[PDB]
């Protein structure tokens, strides 16, 4: 692993892109020079296409996708300076933008691994520092709060404002002056803090939970903590299923929320409705109508919104009244999130 | 060094029944890696007068010298035994038992401190098996220097202390937790026999330190004879160095067993001032052992113990006969309803005051393993103890389950209660509603024999059951609603086994069943009215 | 490492190299580990440990075996150094430690945790039991990598635990560095900093291997995904006291000879076996032959058929027993608890939680809420016994409503939703609310239970005790007057080896019996769909009591005879 050639590869990638105006990364730098956006999204698909273009011309690849996947915290501070080495002139500590990443999909993975849907039981311990894509429900979210990154101190005696960098949860106030003028002096005059020149970040903690059908037999769905920063702070509203891609210290970078041969061979056999009716729960006898309505029940229907402040249900509710559990268990085993059948929190003081 | 050779000559030269008793025992204990050996004080006083008096006067400085001589001969035994077929040897802890004297707890005085002391009692508690060290490597954090310290028998102002200096200043030492040996130890509590304790004051207790080889060898609640060192930490404590738990007695017991009016004098002896109540006295004296314990090959064994209940007005020795059954029977402890003052029949639970820890207080229920239990004031029972005694009176097992401790305690515990939804537990769970030579004969009969029953005397029981079921059915179909069960018949069988067991016989005849039906008829007359 | 190695390390490393040169079973195994890692790297893992069979170590070297058993702190180290040297010598491609594991008999070192005391500290301890808690997986700090930005370069300082060493080296702390040499700030990098995860689990004694003892196990990165509460486990570690065990080998889990198999093969073709085996279980109880015939068919089990791409099928049978309280219904539970493979008995009233299955608790350690498993979740294949069924409340009734049809259970509570599936055949014993019962009273209201619970339980056995002078004459002489270790081996060999299948000779007679009873609906007892399933479960039972590979017509005939006794 070398950095001197990989940084040259990083700075050569952003100026030689034509696969997806013109050089889109330089256009995004012109857009951030126009001061319209504050978020930078880097994909591995462009990296894979640039690697294919460099490998087909007989040049050395010097792989980025096997190096971005391990230690992305060094890469987000190393490629940021390579982006910082070249910017277009505007026409309309000094980080105007925010750098973020996103992994490659499985469709770009089969077409020449790094992004697999991981469980929290499938963490093993040794994945601390790999980019991981976790799937799960979100139960606990917190409010958006400003967390400082660098503390700015000002002096009236020298004028040289100093900046210290914090990394932990807590810190100590540097009352002693560490400037370049107070070292060669008898006087060591008082310093003050600035809440305006100090760089902050929209920090938010979240608790991702383990999926219901992905947990093993008998085990309970344990949780995990995700620490987000910046513009991703409002992309997490509780009561949903999410796929979070980030580094594991969890510092998230990209979030998202919710085969053709397999659907066309099920369609082409003929009488799709009756085949899908008699296919589910075949260990019982008959009752095609009841379980046919169960098929229409788990397919759900259409939720209708009038757009004037009124929402009606797009759901079915089925009763099974009978004389003297298998159908119910088969419906909950085939369908996802099937479950067989508010409070204040003092420590953090909130509505859990 | 001369004492080293003397103890080595005592080990390799003592003879009893034309054989050495310590050499083969050391070889057998080294071959199973027990690291212990049983020596008797009577053998060393019969061997040398230069050893026992010095051991009684100064045990703390002569005992580890004997211990290192034991390891010195053990090293030779190990290297000659390892070379025959198929390094590091710890200090071999010795245990030493004797029965030359049994001083009471009230005879402990300011004299003979730190000497050898042997006494009996009841272990109330042995909850903690804490850890100490025996060999520890220590290192410094400043000049990169390490060493090690060893201790062998000294396990609050004692020898064990870290060095203040090897500049590195005060206390620069770190214990190398990767290379040490752990010596388990226990803190135990012992009290005197409550059958012989003055009425004006509660029985006192004593604290003792238990080492490594005898750990978890004593269940709390039995007649335990402990021999050790009465040391001072002012407060006294006991360092345990040995643990254990007359033919004229058996001769006079065999002479008393040949008397035909023996049952009758026993009954004329259990009631010195009690007027009347012969049927209550015979049922009290026949409910000690229980019955015929039979281990069937199918695994479904039968219970042998029974239940007896006293009821009536205050007085009439309802709590005076219980003191005689507390001081007569082998294993029994006096308690009351819903526990007592700083003691409880039920498994109590409370706070270790050091940093408020949750832990358990054994009552009379776990400590009465293999005997009877005896309580007073049966109407005053808590709901958390009633379910436990409700299961233990018919299944002998007591189950407990809470935070970290889940267990089924065996409780061979018969009940001798006194009293004044309760109707079914009184009428259904109860079957009935010298002194040292007698206790010795009771223990020998409870361990030695396992009787049975003849069919010739069992046909009278069948005829009695058929007649009582044919006679009380007139009162039962007449809507009186009060009974008659096979459990009472099994109790009658256990009563006959106890009555035939008291003459130390494995067979039963009509002589015991004619007294058993007479004992049962008073209980049925009390149950009917 | 920094110190010079003596001959005490070199002799042990050459002895382990000679043992590995003698036995190539570990060398080809680590070569297979390396070629599997190379194939996965070529496509782009296994946790680098080889289990060592201890049986090859006793006959090869007695002193090495004794040194491993009495001093693993001085013997394990050089063996893992030999393993890392063998892993470097067996591989010739460019470019981490390697660990060890043991198995086999231990002798006196294999013991119960309640008998585990202060003796044999340094020696390795094999201890089995049941786990109570499994803590949260926590990553530790080792080798953080720092970036100094003004001069631009990396620094790295690593840390050491005081347990994961099984031996001795100098121990001291180190401040997590915040300032390099001189006056300048430096940043952290966690991209390459290792986070070895650890776990802390608790294990106590199984109730059968104890005259209660629970201990703590510190767990490394490798084996963090193989532990869960509720399962029987056997851990192998070192009893270190800084008291805990450094668990390196975990195995999640009567002996049979070749003489006992000849006896059970000799007793397999006689057609008088079933009646004498049903009569030989409890000789202290007079009568009730068909009830213990069903109890014999009950404790042996079923088949547990798992359907393809659908729900599983219930193989367990359930029995409810009612009658007058005079007989031995409370004396039969002790016999079935002491003679089964594994059994859990509860009183039916007095459970501290919400019932048997589970309970919620608060812990101030984590400052959170944990789950306690009271009963039915412990026994997953055995049997459970509940006496006094009418005193059991509706919450446990709703739970066993799920238990019966499920042969499982489900729970959804504040912060969790899940389903559990442990086999647990139930044996319920009840009493009427009137106290007594006779034939002239109706057989439905005397039961004091709902019709859904009558449909849940398969066999309902009514025991009458009206006073009759003819039958009651011999009970006194019978109670006044094949074996236990044989039927246990019989039941487990039938449970492990033979699975019975259906034939056409036993389908038609059970079809005829079910269609003839679907009579009872007009006369004395309701008929359900489930009962069809329970009418062949028992047949299979009898067919596996005779251990035949398939069923017979007589199995359905004895199931119909058991039905005629328990229904009429």
UniProtKB/Swiss-Prot annotation, chain A:
GO terms for biological process: DNA replication; DNA replication initiation; DNA strand elongation involved in DNA replication; double-strand break repair via break-induced replication; nuclear DNA replication; pre-replicative complex assembly involved in nuclear cell cycle DNA replication; premeiotic DNA replication; silent mating-type cassette heterochromatin formation. Keywords: ATP-binding, Cell cycle, Cytoplasm, DNA replication, DNA-binding, Helicase, Hydrolase, Nucleotide-binding, Nucleus, Phosphoprotein. ATP 1 binds at residues 285, 325. It is found in: Cytoplasm; Nucleus. GO terms for cellular component: chromosome, telomeric region; CMG complex; cytoplasm; DNA replication preinitiation complex; MCM complex; MCM core complex; nuclear pre-replicative complex; nuclear replication fork. Its main location: cytoplasm. Signal peptide: none annotated. One of its GO terms (molecular function) is ATP hydrolysis activity. It comes from the Eukaryota. Present with 166 molecules/cell in log phase SD medium. Early fractionation of eukaryotic MCM proteins yielded a variety of dimeric, trimeric and tetrameric complexes with unclear biological significance. Specifically a MCM467 subcomplex is shown to have in vitro helicase activity which is inhibited by the MCM2 subunit. The MCM2-7 hexamer is the proposed physiological active complex. Acts as a component of the MCM2-7 complex (MCM complex) which is the putative replicative helicase essential for 'once per cell cycle' DNA replication initiation and elongation in eukaryotic cells. Core component of CDC45-MCM-GINS (CMG) helicase, the molecular machine that unwinds template DNA during replication, and around which the replisome is built. Belongs to the MCM family. This is DNA replication licensing factor MCM7. It comes from Saccharomyces cerevisiae (strain ATCC 204508 / S288c). The gene is MCM7. The chain holds residues 12 to 507 of 845 of the full protein.
From Swiss-Prot, chain B:
It catalyses: ATP + H2O = ADP + phosphate + H(+). Its EC number is 3.6.4.12. Residues 262-433 form the MCM domain. It comes from the Eukaryota. It holds the Pfam family MCM_N. Present with 10300 molecules/cell in log phase SD medium. Acts as a component of the MCM2-7 complex (MCM complex) which is the putative replicative helicase essential for 'once per cell cycle' DNA replication initiation and elongation in eukaryotic cells. The active ATPase sites in the MCM2-7 ring are formed through the interaction surfaces of two neighboring subunits such that a critical structure of a conserved arginine finger motif is provided in trans relative to the ATP-binding site of the Walker A box of the adjacent subunit. Component of the MCM2-7 complex. The complex forms a toroidal hexameric ring with the proposed subunit order MCM2-MCM6-MCM4-MCM7-MCM3-MCM5; loaded onto DNA, forms a head-head double hexamer. Interacts with CSM1. This is Minichromosome maintenance protein 5.
UniProtKB/Swiss-Prot annotation, chain C:
GO terms for biological process: DNA replication initiation; DNA strand elongation involved in DNA replication; double-strand break repair via break-induced replication; mitotic DNA replication initiation; pre-replicative complex assembly involved in nuclear cell cycle DNA replication; premeiotic DNA replication; silent mating-type cassette heterochromatin formation; subtelomeric heterochromatin formation. A motif (Arginine finger) lies at residues 455-458. It catalyses: ATP + H2O = ADP + phosphate + H(+). Its EC number is 3.6.4.12. Component of the MCM2-7 complex. The complex forms a toroidal hexameric ring with the proposed subunit order MCM2-MCM6-MCM4-MCM7-MCM3-MCM5; loaded onto DNA, forms a head-head double hexamer. Interacts with CSM1. Keywords: ATP-binding, DNA replication, DNA-binding, Helicase, Hydrolase, Nucleotide-binding, Nucleus, Phosphoprotein. GO terms for cellular component: chromosome, telomeric region; CMG complex; cytoplasm; DNA replication preinitiation complex; MCM complex; nuclear pre-replicative complex; nuclear replication fork; nucleoplasm. This is DNA replication licensing factor MCM3. One of its GO terms (molecular function) is chromatin binding. It is found in: Nucleus. Residues 273-480 form the MCM domain. Acts as a component of the MCM2-7 complex (MCM complex) which is the putative replicative helicase essential for 'once per cell cycle' DNA replication initiation and elongation in eukaryotic cells. The active ATPase sites in the MCM2-7 ring are formed through the interaction surfaces of two neighboring subunits such that a critical structure of a conserved arginine finger motif is provided in trans relative to the ATP-binding site of the Walker A box of the adjacent subunit. The six ATPase active sites, however, are likely to contribute differentially to the complex helicase activity. ATP binds at residues 323-330. Present with 35100 molecules/cell in log phase SD medium. Its main location: nucleus. The chain holds residues 13 to 738 of 971 of the full protein.
């Amino acid at each position: 692993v070398d950095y001197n050639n990989l940084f040259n590869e990083i700075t050569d990638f952003l100026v030689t892109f034509k696969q997806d105006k013109g050089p889109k990364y330089m256009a995004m730098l012109q857009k951030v020079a126009n001061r319209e956006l504050n978020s930078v999204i880097i994909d591995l698909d462009d990296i894979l296409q640039y690697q294919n273009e460099k490998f087909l011309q007989g040049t050395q690849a010097d792989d980025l996708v096997s190096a971005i996947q391990q230690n992305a915290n060094h890469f987000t501070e190393l490629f940021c300076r390579a982006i910082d080495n070249n910017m277009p002139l505007p026409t309309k500590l000094t980080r105007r933008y925010f750098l973020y990443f996103k992994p490659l999909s499985q469709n770009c993975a089969r077409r020449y691994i790094s992004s697999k849907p991981l469980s929290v039981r499938q963490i093993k311990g040794d994945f601390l520092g790999q980019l991981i894509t976790v799937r799960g429900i979100i139960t606990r979210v917190s409010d958006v709060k400003p967390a400082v990154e660098v503390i700015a101190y000002t002096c009236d005696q020298c004028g040289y404002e100093v900046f210290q960098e914090v990394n932990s949860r807590t810190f100590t106030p540097l009352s002693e002056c560490t400037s370049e003028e107070c070292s060669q002096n008898q006087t060591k005059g008082q310093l003050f803090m600035s809440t305006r020149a100090s760089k902050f970040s929209a920090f938010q903690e979240c608790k991702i939970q383990e999926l219901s059908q992905q947990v093993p037999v008998g085990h309970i769905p344990r949780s995990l903590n995700i620490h987000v920063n910046g513009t991703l702070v409002r992309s997490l509203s509780p009561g949903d299923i999410v796929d979070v891609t980030g580094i594991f210290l969890l510092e998230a970078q990209f979030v998202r929320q919710h085969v053709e041969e397999r659907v066309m061979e099920l369609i082409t056999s003929g009488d799709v409705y009756n085949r899908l009716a008699k296919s589910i729960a075949p260990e019982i006898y008959g009752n095609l109508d009841v379980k046919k309505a169960l098929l229409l029940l788990l397919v759900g229907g259409v939720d209708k919104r009038v757009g004037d402040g009124m929402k009606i249900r797009g759901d079915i509710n089925v009763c099974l009244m009978g004389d003297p559990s298998q159908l119910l268990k088969a419906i909950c085993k085939i369908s996802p999130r099937g479950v067989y059948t508010v409070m204040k929190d003092p420590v953090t003081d909130e509505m859990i | 060094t001369e004492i080293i050779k003397s103890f080595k000559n005592f080990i390799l030269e003592f003879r009893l029944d034309s054989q050495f008793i310590y050499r083969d025992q050391l070889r057998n204990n080294i071959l199973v890696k027990n690291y212990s050996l049983t020596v008797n004080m009577e053998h060393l006083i019969g061997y040398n007068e230069d050893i026992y008096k010095k051991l009684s006067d100064e045990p703390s400085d002569i005992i580890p010298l004997f211990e290192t001589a034991i390891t010195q001969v053990a090293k030779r035994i190990s290297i000659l035994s390892r070379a025959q077929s198929a390094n590091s040897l710890p200090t071999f802890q010795l245990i030493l038992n004797s029965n030359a004297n049994q001083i009471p707890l009230r005879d402990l005085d300011s004299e003979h401190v730190s000497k050898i002391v042997r006494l009996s009692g009841i272990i109330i508690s042995t909850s903690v098996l804490s850890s100490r060290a025996t060999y520890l490597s220590i290192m410094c954090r400043n000049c990169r220097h390490t060493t090690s310290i060893t201790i062998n028998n000294f396990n609050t102002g004692n020898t064990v202390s870290l060095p203040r200096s090897c500049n590195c200043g005060p206390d620069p030492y770190i214990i190398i937790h990767e290379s040490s040996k752990f010596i388990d130890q226990q803190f135990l509590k012992l009290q005197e026999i409550p059958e012989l304790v003055p009425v004006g004051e509660m029985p006192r207790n004593l604290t003792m330190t238990c080492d490594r080889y005898l750990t978890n060898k004593v269940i709390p609640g039995t007649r335990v004879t402990i021999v050790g060192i009465y040391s001072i930490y002012r407060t006294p404590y006991i360092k345990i160095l040995g643990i254990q738990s007359t033919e004229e007695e058996e001769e006079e017991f065999l002479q008393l067993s040949r008397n035909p009016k023996l049952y009758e004098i026993l009954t004329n002896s259990i009631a010195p001032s009690i007027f009347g109540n012969e049927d209550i006295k015979k049922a009290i004296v026949c409910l000690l052992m229980g019955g015929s314990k039979k281990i069937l090959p199918d695994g479904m064994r039968l219970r042998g113990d029974i239940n007896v209940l006293l009821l009536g007005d205050p007085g009439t020795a309802k709590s005076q006969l219980l003191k005689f059954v507390e001081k007569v029977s082998p294993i029994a402890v006096y308690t009351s309803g819903k526990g007592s003052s700083a003691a409880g029949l039920t498994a109590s639970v409370q706070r270790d005051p050091m940093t408020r820890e949750f832990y358990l207080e054994g009552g009379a229920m776990v400590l009465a393993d293999g005997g009877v239990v005896c309580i007073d004031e049966f109407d005053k029972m808590r709901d958390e103890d009633r379910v436990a005694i409700h299961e233990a009176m018919e299944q002998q097992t007591i189950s407990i389950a809470k935070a970290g401790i889940t267990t089924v305690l065996n409780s061979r515990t018969s009940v001798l209660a006194a009293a004044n939804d309760f109707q079914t537990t009184i009428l259904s769970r109860f079957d009935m509603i010298s002194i040292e030579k007698m206790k010795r004969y009771i223990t020998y009969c409870r361990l030695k024999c396992a009787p049975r029953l003849s069919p010739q005397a069992a046909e009278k029981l069948s005829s009695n059951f058929v007649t009582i079921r044919k006679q009380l059915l007139i009162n039962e179909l007449e809507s009186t609603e009060r009974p008659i069960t096979i459990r009472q018949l099994e109790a009658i069988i256990r009563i006959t086994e106890s009555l035939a067991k008291l003459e130390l016989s494995p067979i039963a005849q009509e002589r015991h069943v004619d007294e058993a039906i007479r004992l049962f008829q008073a209980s049925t007359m009390d149950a009917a009215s | 490492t920094f110190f010079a190695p003596d001959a005490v390390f070199g002799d042990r490393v050459r002895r382990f190299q000679e043992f590995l040169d003698t036995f190539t079973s570990y060398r080809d195994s680590v070569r297979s580990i390396q070629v599997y890692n190379s194939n996965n790297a070529a496509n782009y893992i296994l946790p680098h440990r080889i289990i060592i069979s201890l049986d090859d170590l006793r006959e090869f070297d007695r002193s090495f075996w004794s040194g491993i058993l009495v001093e693993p702190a001085y013997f394990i180290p050089p063996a893992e150094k030999a393993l890392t040297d063998l892993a470097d010598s067996m591989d010739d491609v460019p470019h981490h430690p390697w660990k060890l594991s043991f198995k086999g008999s231990f002798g006196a070192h294999a013991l119960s945790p309640r008998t585990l005391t202060a003796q044999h500290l340094n020696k390795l301890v094999s201890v089995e039991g049941i786990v109570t808690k499994t803590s949260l997986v926590r990553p530790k700090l080792i080798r953080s990598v720092h970036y100094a930005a003004k001069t631009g370069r990396f620094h790295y300082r690593d840390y050491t635990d005081a347990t994961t060493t099984l031996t001795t080296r100098i121990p001291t702390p180190a401040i997590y560095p915040t300032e390099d040499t001189e006056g300048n700030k430096l940043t952290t990098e966690y991209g390459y900093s290792t986070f070895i995860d650890h776990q802390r689990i608790t294990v106590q004694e199984m109730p059968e291997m104890a005259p209660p003892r629970s201990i703590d196990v510190i767990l490394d990165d490798d084996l963090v995904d193989k532990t869960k509460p509720g399962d029987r486990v056997n851990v192998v570690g070192v009893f270190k006291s800084l008291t805990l065990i450094l668990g390196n080998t975990v195995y999640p889990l009567q002996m049979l000879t070749d003489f006992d198999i000849r006896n059970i093969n000799k007793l397999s073709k006689k057609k008088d076996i079933f009646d004498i085996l049903s009569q030989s279980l409890a000789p202290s109880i007079y009568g009730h032959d068909h009830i213990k015939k069903a109890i014999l068919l009950m404790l042996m089990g079923g088949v547990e058929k798992n359907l393809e791409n659908g729900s599983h099928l219930r193989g367990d049978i359930n029995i409810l027993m009612v009658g007058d309280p005079s007989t031995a219904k409370s004396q039969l539970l002790r016999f079935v608890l002491n003679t089964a493979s594994l059994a859990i008995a509860t009183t039916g009233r007095g459970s501290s939680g919400v019932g048997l299955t589970a309970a919620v608790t608060t812990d101030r350690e984590t400052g959170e809420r944990r789950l306690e498993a009271g009963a039915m979740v412990l026994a997953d294949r055995g049997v459970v016994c509940i006496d006094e069924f009418d005193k059991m409340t509706d919450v446990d009734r709703v739970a066993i409503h799920e238990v019966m049809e499920q042969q499982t259970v489900t729970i959804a509570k504040a912060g969790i939703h899940t389903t559990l599936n442990a086999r647990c055949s139930v044996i319920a014993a009840a009493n009427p609310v009137f106290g007594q019962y006779d034939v002239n009273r109706d057989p439905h209201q005397n039961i004091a239970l709902p019709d859904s619970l009558l449909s849940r339980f398969d066999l309902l056995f009514v025991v009458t005790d009206d006073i009759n002078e003819i039958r009651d004459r011999s009970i006194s002489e019978h109670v006044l007057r094949v074996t236990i270790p044989f039927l246990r081996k019989y039941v487990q060999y039938a449970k492990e080896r033979v699975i019975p299948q259906l034939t056409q000779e036993a389908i038609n007679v059970i079809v005829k019996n079910y269609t003839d009873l679907r009579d009872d609906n007009t006369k004395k007892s309701p008929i359900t769909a489930r009962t069809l399933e329970t009418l062949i479960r028992l047949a299979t039972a009898h067919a596996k009591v005779r251990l035949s590979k398939t069923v017979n017509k007589v199995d359905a005939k004895v199931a119909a005879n058991l039905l005629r006794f328990a229904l009429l």
